[PDB]
Amino acid sequence: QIRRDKLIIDTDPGIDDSMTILMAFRAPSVEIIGLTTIFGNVDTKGATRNALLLCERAGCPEVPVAEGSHEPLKGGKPRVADFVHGSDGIGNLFLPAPSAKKVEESAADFLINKVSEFPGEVSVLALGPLTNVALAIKRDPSFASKVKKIVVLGGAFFAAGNVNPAAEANIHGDPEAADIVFTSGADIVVVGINITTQVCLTDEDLLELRNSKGKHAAFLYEMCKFYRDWHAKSDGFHGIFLHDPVSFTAVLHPEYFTFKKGVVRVETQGICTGHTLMDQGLKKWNSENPWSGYKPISVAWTVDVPKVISFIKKLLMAP
Template identity: 55%
Template sequence: MEQSASTKKIIIDTDPGIDDAMAILMAFHSPEVDVIGLTTIYGNVPTSLATHNALYLLEVIGREDVPVAHGSAMSLKNVPKLRIADFVHGKDGLGNISFPPPKNKAVDLCAKEFLVKMANMFPGEITVVALGPLTNIALAIEADPMFVKNIKQIVILGGAFFVNGNVNPAAEANILGDPEAADIVFTSGADILVIGINITHQVVLTDKQLMQLEESESAFAKFVCKIAPFYFTYHHEAYDIKGVYLHDPTALAAALDASLFTFASGVVRVQLEGISRGMTIFNNTGKRWGEVSAWCNNPAVKVAVTVDAHRINSMLMERLLKM
């Protein structure tokens, strides 16, 4: 795709994942952005499989030139991901389609090193779209004090603001995957947009729209139809809805066009202990507190509070159907 001077450079930090795959496909049919790399992280699948899936998706898209950097397999506390969402995405992360091994390999740089290198190479130009736990991003922040200044923006899929979590009543999966990393990123001072499940649960790809994709000759639409049935079955059974939540495509949409959302600004901290470990707590009241607390003297982030779900749904459909 020909890129204009105004095209935004993005790196997608991802744990593919059926909805990650939809977001990645959407990105490569989006003239607003130039995907300059994928970094991988555990979450929906272990990191090793996330890297395989990312490489395979680039083959499907025909963009094997885009580098993939293998990310951390452990949280900052050196804990492996205990809960892999194979019941949502299948054991291979892509709906149990038994895809062949990818032909390419990840680059020699790990995800942390790749993020730092790209931010230094293109200061003020790169948006990171973080679709999984935030370990790689936190490691980049710790590795290079200039990373938060060099990176243009970080768009985070994570948190459950004003609603229950999706792992337990307190926590959303990406944040619970590495709460310590999330707290480092939220308080880093980077320009951050946060898209929580309070937003993504409003954006649904319906059963009827899947049928529309099945009737298309678009290669992207055909691939989504191949991997999607497992994801749709999970949503039918778990949520009793006639469709699927578009978590990752919604976060990508925030990188494409933030005007699709309204945001409130405030400090976000992450609960690190106890029954509510992984809870994202948002101070957006503007109240001047009477005592010093963990929310004082920390930089604000922007948390999405409303979304134009119809426009995001239409955007995804348009780009998946594009020939």
């Protein structure tokens, strides 16, 4: 009935990625044109397996799943967040293998091809390390102008990281890729954990979800048991933060946030590897520095927490 905006989700499912993907398949204003997978919460092969299973669970096994890079741009087999998302990446449910199969092309080929087929039409929601997006940008200098918005869940702006004091997980997963994306000149919107740690579902909210008429309520509640237990052990919070679902909310309802423009750079070496730092442009520097001359991006600054929670709950609890 209503106009659908084309969206590619680049993801490492992942418990909150899974919640976001299932919400996105239910959003009537969205047309998911594909899922592109990356490592982080689980190895890339595990992320592809979960993405194919989510397409089957949502009743859309025809939605293409394109497998991305198995390692960051600097190389090396990545250590994955199995202590947060379980050994299978979805809270240790150990589900049977999907029947649907991934497409032949890589995530980077898929991103380039779709953006070239529908110029200015396709937005990218990046929910994991930015390796595939950086590969597309490096391979295609016209990608930045052809893509619509790139909404990124990543970074920690003037706030503690979540892998260590300096870095947020997605950026730490591939700092070089994040620096390439943020300096690409594309229309980028970054939602850091400085924003998403303000948006939580309590144990009571999780029980409300389990008791709801939500299409995937049972599955969402089961995955969230492991996820909630990690938040209790590590952050001392009884419930879960909503990271990937808040970035999806910034795609559909940017009016629930305020944004600041600024050049963003990523530290790629030393103790602060993975740190994201924005130059707001409020001070005139005496000399040039690593933030000089780049095109600024939009950084989520404040969030209307009740409006975001209401929107997420509505999609999760929808029959």
